[PDB]
Design a protein around this nucleic acid. Structure first.
Length: 365
RNA sequence: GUCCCCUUCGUCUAGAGGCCCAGGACACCGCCCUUUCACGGCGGUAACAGGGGUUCGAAUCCCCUAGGGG
């Protein structure tokens, strides 16, 4: 009854403990590690390698064979690649929101049984799996403010059933703690950040490495020039940084925010106030529909939906808009719904799976 | 080529003799937050056009050179 589990390890405590957890549960544990990004320069690469050490070092202090892989290939092709066009089209893609659909769960898992010959797989993901009615459902896991369900909305029960998530049963604190008392090197290590598989770094310069900058002009809700523009794909609805504005005579003395990008004319509509009308919306239309349930959705649904990782369950109503498209209707208005980002709907503990935001439902005003 | 009024941190400005080694907001910066991008939170840097006066005291008074005014 003791099966083979491959815990992907990304040098983080999460993964770490996560494994030691299965270990305890019994499962013959074996960890793997993915090299999926051809290091830009060195200061980073340095890190990259380093992580692997902490990686190994953990498996070692535990007694688990750490493997290695270079899915770097797929990544760029099946992930980064798209991630680009999306931005090129002046939209805001969630790279990580796919790390999981193409690499972490498809690719990984594949190369898990076809090679590493394992049955079950496990990520460090602070989420949670629950089987019911004979189908595997995706849950959030205690400490919602620290849950990660949002990213695994593309996952589909078949995929899930095959995976295991230790941690999603614990509380973030415990996790680090355990690792501390275990002597695990990772304990007391900043929980990453930035694109999955790629190092956290100042965006602006990074995106600049794959696209040219055509500095347009920053307009205004009241239609009137005001700021420069130094590029355009470096922004997203509701953003507030990098706008220079210092207000004038008629200025609510409050911060200015994006509120609509003008792709063609290459403009940039900016308003003032994290509440301005042009900043809110009452719903949206979502394509690229993925249901954990992986079963046809027709008709109408009543639930909640996040609109950006760590947003906040916003009660809404879902109408089966079309082929794949869906019209969501926020109970109240929503702040800066941004297309491209993924909208995930939950029915309580359960994440039903989301989709890509493609249509912003403007406020009447 | 006669008498008037203007000049403050990057920006918009608080300030009408001592409480201003100049205050606020927005920006810029940093940390916190955070596996996207962002929001958010907490902090930080930075200005009296310049030179003489007058007063115990001067951003605010007078006086000289650089921006608008029937």
């Amino acid at each position: 009854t003791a099966k083979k589990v491959i815990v992907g390890m990304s040098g983080g405590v999460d993964s770490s403990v996560s494994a030691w957890l299965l270990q305890q549960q019994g499962y013959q544990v074996e960890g793997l590690f993915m090299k999926n990004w051809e290091e830009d320069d060195g200061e980073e690469y340095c890190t990259a390698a380093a992580d692997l050490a902490d990686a190994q070092a953990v498996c070692d202090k535990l007694g688990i064979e750490l493997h290695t892989v270079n899915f770097a290939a797929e990544y760029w092709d099946n992930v980064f690649e798209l991630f680009l066009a999306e931005y090129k089209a002046g939209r805001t893609p969630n790279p990580d929101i796919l790390c999981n659909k193409e690499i972490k769960f498809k690719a990984f898992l594949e190369f898990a049984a076809e090679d590493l010959g394992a049955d079950y797989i496990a990520t460090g993901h602070y989420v949670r799996r629950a089987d019911v009615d004979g189908k595997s459902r995706l849950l959030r896991g205690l400490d919602s403010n620290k849950d990660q369900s949002y990213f695994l909305y593309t996952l589909s029960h078949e995929q899930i059933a095959q995976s295991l998530f230790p941690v999603g049963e614990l509380e973030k604190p415990q996790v680090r703690k355990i690792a501390e008392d275990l002597g695990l090197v990772t304990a007391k290590k900043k929980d990453s950040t930035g694109i999955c598989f790629i190092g956290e770094r100042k965006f602006r310069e990074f995106l600049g490495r794959y696209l040219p900058a055509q500095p347009g002009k920053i307009i205004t809700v009241d239609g009137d020039e005001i700021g420069e523009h130094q590029g355009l794909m470096y922004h997203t609805l509701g953003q507030r940084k990098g706008l220079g504005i210092g207000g004038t005579k008629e200025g609510t003395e409050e911060p200015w925010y994006v509120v609509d990008k003008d792709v063609e004319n290459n403009i940039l509509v900016v308003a003032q106030g994290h509440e301005h009308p042009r900043l809110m919306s009452v719903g949206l239309i979502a394509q690229q529909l993925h249901w954990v349930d992986r079963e046809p959705f027709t008709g109408t649904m009543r639930c909640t939906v996040k609109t950006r990782y760590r947003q906040t369950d916003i009660p809404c109503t879902v109408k089966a808009l079309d082929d794949d498209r869906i019209e969501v209707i926020f109970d109240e208005p929503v702040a800066a719904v941004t297309p491209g980002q993924s909208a995930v709907f939950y029915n309580g503990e359960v994440c039903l799976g989301g989709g890509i935001i493609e249509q912003r439902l403007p406020l009447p005003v």
